[model samples]
Target: VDDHHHGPKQVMVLKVTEPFTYDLKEDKRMFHATVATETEFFRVKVFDTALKSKFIPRNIIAISDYFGCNGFLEIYRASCVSDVNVNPTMVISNTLRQRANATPKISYLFSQARGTFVSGEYLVNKKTERNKFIYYGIGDDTGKMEVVVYGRLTNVRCEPGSKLRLVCFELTSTEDGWQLRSVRHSYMQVI
Candidate 1:
């Protein structure tokens, strides 16, 4: 049987916003982002990182040949994007802002499923480098856990005793225990 029916190539000019998740399921690194145009918001699920590289937050880009399935716009191997000179002025609603900054307790993170997006305020207890990854021992009032910063976040400095607020991070399970990992689009700031 055929995989599915794909309509003709579609196009949309949009701007990426805060709060995104890189879905690391098995061998697939599907990137998910929330985008908005001047009038509406859309969900983008990009299957290829090559195309994902252009999906930076606050940048206006145009996409074509993407699959519009159900309520989501899926971008696979053939979907392409290019830089846009014109900025499509749009405002992200207050609710999305609140959701982006909402912090849940540390224990709550462990209870949630893997790849869950989480933001929280934590203090750096220690910093360590294991192989190519940088790990930070962080804790809050509720509990403590290790955070692995990768991709662009690896350059972020979280020295010991520093209190920082992390946004758009993902929860991952390691053989040792539950841990927090930074994705390509994660944000961290000392507060």
Candidate 2:
């Protein structure tokens, strides 16, 4: 037997040494069991194969601004399709709300560094433009997004497959699709 403390609850793990009987109530979805033990008693719930498959992990998790207010706060994971590694703390952006009901547009500010740290502004898109931007989730491919690099990025050459990290404030869905908004310098990083 082993005992562990988690938060305010004390949990015990033990090996079953005897046979026990339990009863299940179908209509009420209740289970009742009786067992004899020298110490304390506990309850456990088991999961089936279908229930186990729903717990896959996501790559890009977003923390929304609606937190601490009306909307439900959640961290959702999405698959990362780009090579950009984001700097969490130094990145900044301003979100401009388009029209009255239009979704917000995010403008990011990158940091300045000479070696491992470099900063610049890039407009995220799928095609090549005179301006620098990283594009993600391009075209008919509905599952991913793109981050395009422009400006100094168009001329400078780094490692071929090097990853760039970006820090944005929040991301919201729009009629044209999902757009990132209000990127700014915060506690974020690229790894």
Candidate 3:
């Protein structure tokens, strides 16, 4: 709801994400931010002398010109620009915004698992408390595949005749077979 007049330029409303706080790194003057739109998510810096690091998570903002992408979508820059936070003039649902910035994903169904709960082996480093990863085997009548879970929490209910609605899980061919890797953003549901 931007009532302030800042000329007739198009103010882009990109959704802010993690790393929103100003953590001015060495040799850096501005804060780093992650932002995304219905199109894609990209990295940008709030360099506007007027704006500085006033941006926050969920702040819909507008930016223009100057810097551009470095291909690979790995980096994007909007320099020498002025961006302002604005209240939504229209409805932009959170669910819709999440999907816009969602990672590469897939869904799978488990019918007959070679095994379900092998006691869910969870490992952690005594020093960092970082998980190594968790895995189990599950599949349909067509064949059996391995369900590999990574990133925090290796605990799961694994047993035969288990139906799982895996959403946003990863799939890849490995020397063993198709590996279903789940990320923190991914979920495993029992049906």
Model 3 scores a TM of 0.32
RMSD of each: 7.4, 23.3, 12.3
What's the count of clashing pairs in each model shown? 0, 45, 5
Worst 10 residues of 2 by lDDT: 28-37
TM-score of each predicted structure versus truth: 0.49, 0.21, 0.32
Stretches of candidate 2 off by over 4 Å are 1-127, 130-134, 137-142, 148-162, 186-191
Instruction: In model 2, state the lDDT of residue 38.
Output: 23
lDDT of each: 0.65, 0.24, 0.41
Query: For model 2, how does the per-residue alpha-carbon lDDT over 45-130 read when each residue is reduced to its tens digit?
Result: 11121211221221111111211111111111222112122222221111211111121122221121111211212322344344
Superior by TM-score: candidate 1 or candidate 3: 1
lDDT of 1 by residue, 1-191 (tens): 12333443223324343333343344455555656554456666676766656777666666666766534566776356666564455465667644534567788887888987666778899998877798889877778889888765666666999987775577898888778888654667677
